Amino acid sequence: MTSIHFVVHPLPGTEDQLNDRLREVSEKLNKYNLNSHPPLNVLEQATIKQCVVGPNHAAFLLEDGRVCRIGFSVQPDRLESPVSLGEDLQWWPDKDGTKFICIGALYSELLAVSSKGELYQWKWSESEPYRNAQNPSLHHPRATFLGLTNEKIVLLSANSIRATVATENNKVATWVDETLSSVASKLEHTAQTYSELQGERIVSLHCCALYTCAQLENSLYWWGVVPCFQRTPKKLCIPEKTEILAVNVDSKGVHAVLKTGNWVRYCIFDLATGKAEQENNFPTSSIAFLGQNERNVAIFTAGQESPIILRDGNGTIYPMAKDCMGGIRDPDWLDLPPISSLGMGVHSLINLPANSTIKKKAAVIIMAVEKQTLMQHILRCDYEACRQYLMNLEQAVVLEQNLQMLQTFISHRCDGNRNILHACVSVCFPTSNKETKEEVVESKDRKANAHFILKLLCDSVVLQPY
């Protein structure tokens, strides 16, 4: 099971401010252990594939094919939880019984792609998605113009202003928000398979207001207005025999994570030279960043002007900050379970009084945080809860039941690739010389309980083989 948490951050801001938002959040999971609000409790047992923010609504795609959306409000308590939701959640008016494969967003409307490859339009102000009474498979009024009424869509990327798709037939197509229709005549293009993209499949798409990049099986290509029209896809100067782990875009250019044999480096690419304008090594081990499943690597970003969230091969938020040379600071750990999926979006704050210290913009971030129940008891120093869990896991071993639950717990990680015993040890750390001079859980009991927990874990027949 997972839990959904909401985070808000003014823009522009800083990486360590953001890390402190995550830190602030990370406290609550181990101090309050509060019950989740009803409106989204239905999603705790659900599996979430993708999460997104439109200008006034969140929306979620489930692995079971269902989609839903919900309007949101920022709490004045941090216009100064920072977020409050309505109790009315809207499930997709699926009168066809057709499941969805991915979703995306534009300023006027939600976007969705069905498993049939059909394109759906649903304006945020509408109670139902668009349907053509004269064409039951046409769920987007401009799909005819794009040729997409006869082309199965298989990938989408869309952020406020621009939307780009790949068809199963490798044809690219691109459209823009309705308010841009007066300039769209020079920005949009129908379903076309560019010769520069022939020879590789589009593996993912990275859209923004000015341009889109396509990530292909062994190369990167991009087109649109430069960060002035790159009219046809342009190849980037990718080094040979290298594997590309993830990619994303902003007004600054392209950001991507490159492997090279056992090495990993973080890279900013410039579309003018087509080469990397900066590379940095990480201060940690590279293998630690690659984790247990490399495919988990990502680079979530808010959009334009954005904060960044790297993710490791286990699902950790990697706690980046620049150093004062412009390299990478050591990882200022955050003590978090892995994030199964994460939504981001940019929100206007013109709703504020004009005197405000918080700026006219913030990011809204939506986190499907995973529930590591026994890891939380260790971190909470709840000695009795840890003991009870071990007693139940002991019964589980004797009864030969929920054995996968035990293996899953043993395989749990939080950030920095710390297993349970690293978590115990970190908890046992001293915090002041006043404590040694003198020599929610109180600090005195915190150390005592942590040491008793460490001893208990070292003693338990549950853990002995591990």
Q: What would the DSSP string read from start to end of 402-454? A: SHHHHHHHHT---GGG--HHHHHHHHT----HHHHHH----HHHHHHHHHHHH
Place of tokens 């392209």: 254
Tokens of 421: 């015993």
Of 368, 372, 312, residue with least CA distance to 337: 372
- Asked if residues 169 and 151 have their Cβ atoms less than 8 Å apart, the reply is yes
Tokens of 134: 């004269």
Of 289, 246, 252, residue with least CA distance to 269: 252
Q: Which experiment gave this structure?
A: cryo-EM
Between the CA of residue 31 and those of 75, 81, 311, 442, what are the distances in Å? 22, 15, 25, 11
Helix (H) or strand (E) holding 387: helix 383-398
